[PDB]
Amino acid sequence: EKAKSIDQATLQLLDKAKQDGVETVWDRKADMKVQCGFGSAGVCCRNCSMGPCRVSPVPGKGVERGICGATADVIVSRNFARMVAAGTAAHSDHGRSIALSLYHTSKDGDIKVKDENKLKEVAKSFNVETEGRDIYDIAHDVAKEGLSNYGKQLGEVTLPPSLPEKRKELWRKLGVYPRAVDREIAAVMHSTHIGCNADAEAMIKMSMRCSLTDGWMGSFMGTEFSDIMFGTPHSIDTEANLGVLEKNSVNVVLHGHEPLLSEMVVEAASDPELVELAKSVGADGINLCGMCCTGNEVSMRHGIKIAGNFMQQELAVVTGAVDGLIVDVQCIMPALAKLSKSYHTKFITTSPKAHITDSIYMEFDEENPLDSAKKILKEAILNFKNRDQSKVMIPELKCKAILGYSVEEIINKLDKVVNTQIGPMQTVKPLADVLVSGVLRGAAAVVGCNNPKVVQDSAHIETIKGLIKNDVIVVVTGCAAQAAAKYGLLQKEAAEKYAGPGLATVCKLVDIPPVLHMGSCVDISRILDLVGRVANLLGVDMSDLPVAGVAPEWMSEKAVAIGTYVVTSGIDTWLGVAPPVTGGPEVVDILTNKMEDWVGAKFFIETDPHKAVEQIVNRMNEKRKKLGI
Amino acid sequence: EKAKSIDQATLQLLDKAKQDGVETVWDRKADMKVQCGFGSAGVCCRNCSMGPCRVSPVPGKGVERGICGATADVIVSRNFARMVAAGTAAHSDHGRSIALSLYHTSKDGDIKVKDENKLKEVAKSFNVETEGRDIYDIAHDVAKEGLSNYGKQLGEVTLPPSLPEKRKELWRKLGVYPRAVDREIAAVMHSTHIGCNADAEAMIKMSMRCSLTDGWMGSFMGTEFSDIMFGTPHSIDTEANLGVLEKNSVNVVLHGHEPLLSEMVVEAASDPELVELAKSVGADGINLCGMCCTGNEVSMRHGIKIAGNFMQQELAVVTGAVDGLIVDVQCIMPALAKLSKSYHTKFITTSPKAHITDSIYMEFDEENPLDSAKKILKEAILNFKNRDQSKVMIPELKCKAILGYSVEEIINKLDKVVNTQIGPMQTVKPLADVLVSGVLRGAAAVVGCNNPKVVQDSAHIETIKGLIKNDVIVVVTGCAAQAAAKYGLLQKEAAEKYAGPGLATVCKLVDIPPVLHMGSCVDISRILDLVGRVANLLGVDMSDLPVAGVAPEWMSEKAVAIGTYVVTSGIDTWLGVAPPVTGGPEVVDILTNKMEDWVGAKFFIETDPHKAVEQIVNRMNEKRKKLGI
Amino acid sequence: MNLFQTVFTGSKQALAAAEGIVKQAVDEKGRDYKVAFPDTAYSLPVIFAATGKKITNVGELEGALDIVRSLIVEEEMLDKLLNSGLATAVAAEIIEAAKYVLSDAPYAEPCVGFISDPIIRSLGVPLVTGDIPGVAVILGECPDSETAAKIIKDYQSKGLLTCLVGKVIDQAIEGKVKMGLDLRVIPLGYDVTSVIHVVTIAIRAALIFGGIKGGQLNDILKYTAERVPAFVNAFGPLSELVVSAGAGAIALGFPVLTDQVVPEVPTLLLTQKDYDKMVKTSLEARNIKI
Amino acid sequence: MNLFQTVFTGSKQALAAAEGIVKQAVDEKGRDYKVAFPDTAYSLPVIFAATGKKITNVGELEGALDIVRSLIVEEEMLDKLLNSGLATAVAAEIIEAAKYVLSDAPYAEPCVGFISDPIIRSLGVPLVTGDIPGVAVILGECPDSETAAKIIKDYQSKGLLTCLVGKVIDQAIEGKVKMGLDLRVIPLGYDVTSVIHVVTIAIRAALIFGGIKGGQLNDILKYTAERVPAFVNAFGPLSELVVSAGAGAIALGFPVLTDQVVPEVPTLLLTQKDYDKMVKTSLEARNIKIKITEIPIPVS
């Protein structure tokens, strides 16, 4: 009855998936039928073997306390905290693997330093000497200092310069100034143990402290170091949606998050070995396509075509044209192993952190990265031989998109509209001016996942379109960014189409689309980098700026951790999917009201995107009046 | 119905709790009614907001896969892994706070180095120079090397000397050699995220890798450094059970884990200022009593009387004589806040890691430890003022116990039976001889919690009595040790009463009780220290020795991590309470069968203690038969 | 002091001044007195370019206040601000037309006042060939008489036309600069509302040289932004009224260089305090190459 | 091999050997023939102390094999091992009694054989005063005659009694040591079973000097472990049988010092390879202190 999607190519293959007799994420959601109201409210705890316990989400009725004595608010707050710890650990291991690769960069190695100017600037942030030194001794010293932020037990952590000093002292007084990344994860896991913390306020404050090690450390260093090794992203053209797959070419789909694998696969897609081999098996060439974050990482830097977002990963195999599905970690549906059995697709897992049963494990050798990527890519090209071309169905639907809008490239674009004799170059002042002047009402960050509880891509597009119509420039990462690319919002032509007068005028002068794709979900740090620079340039805190974050169709624990550190930084966050907190009245009051008194921002729960846009515009206008702009 | 306990004082006060009209942990267990069969089997996953999902524990029937595609085995293995990660993080912060106190030790400070020979021996293990140096410069260098083991990202970790090289090489080949403590916690949390690990074998192997950072690092350093600062335990007499409370004295009950607080309170209980105040308010003196681990920590070193174990903590307040309940972290029932409202007892929380709502928070100032302990103890003495002596009911039931049997003291006791001219002194040779000869059939470690699913203390006593009857020496820690103390097993008189011929003869020669209390659950590292020395002295691995571990009434996630690293070390582990794994057939095969092929040991799930004892004796005889002893 | 609110305020101030001087018109001359500008075939060029209707009598001039009020939508959106800036320009023509009906010769030299149609044709052909690279509508008050002449003689030496309006006219004659059409220095009026007489230059240039019919407002604004290269230089303190007028020059497509601190908008509203290089920023902001 | 199995092995071997020589008794002498030891008031001292019944004829000696079979419970528990060691001692008396029934004079010098009751009492009064600090039941074979005599003459010089049984008797006469009751050196027999004649010394010491009635086995073993200070020194290779006999000495409370590698048990079964200090380990393991002689000092 309810529509499964709004993308046509997504719907066409959903009909083929029904014909082929295979299961999809939509089909398994309907099989769950009425999901339990105790876990959807957060009033269930399994933190020991005295349980499992469940208390009533209605205060005053039913069972009031768990066996140990934990109230509904205590149970909810502890379940929330562990979601943040899980989300933090996902981005932690993400950035940890990136920093380790930087330590292993050598002149005669597969991994090299490509953006030297970024390294020299990042080294200054870590108090690393650069004058007269070799560029790889600098890279190793920065990696050592960066890795220390994950597990140092003495001293203070290193935080990026764009973090306003007003916000730092605000965390100190609140008592949530972050420590080591892994240290905070264990601290949350410790206090969530049975018989430990039993106070909603102190528990949530621990979650906020833990999330700060993600946005301003984990994701930041993960983004900081990826640009150094693979190149700082710049504006680059690409194509999106499932129509990028070529019937007469080798379709290798890179899925996952950790970019090191996908980066080597891209370089291995130019080896005369695999280019000629792709022709010897009867194909035109190697057609690389990415999905989710690892697809964003290569699209931002090399313009690799984007096959699709989260809930589309199953329908890519349904096409029957995917020869090699190469995945690493995070958000790789284990159903792909059973699904790929109904096709010739070779579902390949590579990282030891994410083994999948009944899949093809080809361990990515990080000591010989280029050789290992060639070996994996060879196994995908050789599988084109087993393709049956009568059953292949690639929907003829693909839309152009422009991405690559890193903080450096956005600043570079802003230099076009600066008068040579007046203002300073290489700053975020042009963006601060149009915000202060009022041409741009505000700036919104639309990120998030897909969720079967929401018509996929519908809430993402309705939110972005609503915001840009109200002269609110939108920046996007993750699957929300890929939803905009498929729809066709990442185009310069979308300014006159969907944006209001003010935003469309900014797009013409700067020569940019109304929606700025800023990379993967670890690249959300760029938005913190961006908003922070504007707050510092205006001598204010980030809780004073008319900024907002939206997660219309979030799902992962990473989304929980992402939203938390955005609020603690001082940016209002809207949630399109209700988090499991409805059973704790005090927890709801903390997240949607009391948070304002702590960090100058709060969470918003609104399932209707049209209602959220109204709330975002009204909240921004309120902060504008308070600031006098 | 089933009896709630086997302790008489426990039953007497459970009636007073019914008379006074207050709820206990037993009352809240019955209110939970039929706990869910989905969470008790482990076939429920809440690792994102697409769920909550539930699959059928019966393979071949019902719903087989979750929304992301995770099978029953995947969900179980991931829920199990997070239990291990949580238990590891609990002991991690325990030892982390201890190592930090060692770094802050000074000559004229509240925290001092008391066992310099232990420190000098530990310094050699960390490659720290000691010759001709100041004793506090040594202590600071050891603390830094110890703290590095929690979050170092490069190099290898420092492992204790008693770890056999055969076991190290076995872990390396299996791929579970530990890294940093916090690093492994985050690694498990990463792979348990949605779309990550989906293989039962690799998931459990990650849990094994994480648990090793607890027993051989976290718990080990916490115990190693506690002995350095507070003194290595030696044979000392004490009294146990709830009869230790004195009606005419100030009853301050120390509950929790972190020993620094309880240690300072003991020293503050001799201040002439605070002694006179205890008399001015109408009391005879300060009567210190401990509970759970922090009660063992002070009892092992200073002979402080032990009030009771886990499920007795509520009944201590029911007496109406507890004036001050000082708690820190871990295993403090949040119901104590609501329970203490029905009495004059001042329920005081001290650590910021474990805030409890509606309690009295008096932050333990680690910068002024003795002064802060005096201020907290004064508020407990001042609360004796509000005592109602008509409502006080203290059952006259307490049994003597002997504890303080550290590895150093056990070796010292073994020197009594060494011939001056023959063997070497200060070795574990006497214990290895009686084991090889066959006088002692084996050695068993009975640890664990209490659980409402088992008649409390019944499974502990029936297991210990059964083992010592079969000439199997028993060592005990945690609440299982305190259950033996209450019953009266920690006495030298228990040899003729309950032990077999072989064990009673060994007890007469060595002058020790048949059950050796070895301290708290972080002191379980002493048992690994002990078993390792016996394995090294006989040139074999630990999977060859006739050793076994029992957790008759476990409950906490800490127990899961404890049981895991005991199995990974190579010691068979029996569980008296079924862990939530019954829904995953492959996970059960891994934990109860395939583990033997991996680490030479496996888990056993047996709720009947008399059946478990039979399994232990038969398993030991097999390992003796395999070894030729 | 929100920029949108500041423009809306001065726009409402411009309307209130137009209502005041048009009430003087109906009282001293009646609703049927001839309203026209000297030697113009387009009646009121701004109102003509917007509505395609000519204004003849005072009753129609009074009824043209309704045009100003319709463009003063008070919502903080850009299209509302450019419309509000156009409203100020229409109201400035109402005030300036009323000046010509209350007095037979309201502007006396050195003030030139309104610019006749034959001057548009004469001055128009070098603008197309680029003989005069642009026009400079410098208005306001300079902090020193020397810096006013220094800038105007710099613009004059570049060959382009400069248009003085406000106190800078007094500062220019003090600066020993010589005015005149052949001198390419034209002073319009001392009142702020006299800036419409350079605005009517570009609009009439779109009607004459662009062949665009009256009432094609969006097309007139395109011709002004692309063909005629105009820029306005505001000096000294800026009242709410002149700020509102600046948005009208933005609607035509002309950047606004000033020395007063103001919420800048790239390529449209900039603040340059260095008077020695002010000429250089203005030529760049309008893409003027000598 | 597992130590418990080694004790069970020699105990079953001792039973099989006892069944063999008692079968010779019923064929050459019939089921009714006098069975006794010279000048003993306790019949069979080991069997008497355990059951309180005396053995007179061969039919009763044959019926006393059931005592050995009852003491050989083959479960790996300490109390079963001490009982199995006692079974070997009872079987050693059965074989040794059969030696005295098949031959009127089965033991010829230098072998003394059985020790009479008047010798026990004569040797008993100095034991209480501590005149002889202990007894040394050294059996087996030394690797060198000099190291054997060096040890036996050391024990004799300490004033305590030593009892030889096995090949060490031949090594002692080669080593020029002198035997005799007054010399506190008694050679028993060349067969392993002849060690039982020193076991009967301590048992009879419990019956005579301890006043304990026959059949109070637990009390006899208490007297034996506390009062009489005995220790056994086993030299050379150890068969399963002699190992089984060692468990009997443990039941009496006597440590077993040896030079052969063996699963040690503290204070009960130890391995000392240094023959020069072997005497000192034996004196310590049994708590033997030499009585010094100090000249009297008067202060009047």
Ligand code: SF4
């Ligand atoms: S933490 Fe408490 S409420 Fe939760 S399952 Fe455990 S005993 Fe029950």
Ligand code: SF4
């Ligand atoms: S264990 Fe809890 S979350 Fe799971 S199905 Fe049962 S009530 Fe729901």
Ligand code: SF4
């Ligand atoms: S990880 Fe899988 S089973 Fe768990 S909530 Fe997510 S989709 Fe459901």
Ligand SMILES: [Mg+2]
């Ligand atoms: Mg950045």
Ligand SMILES: [Mg+2]
């Ligand atoms: Mg060294």
Ligand SMILES: [Mg+2]
């Ligand atoms: Mg006692």
Ligand SMILES: [Mg+2]
């Ligand atoms: Mg000219």
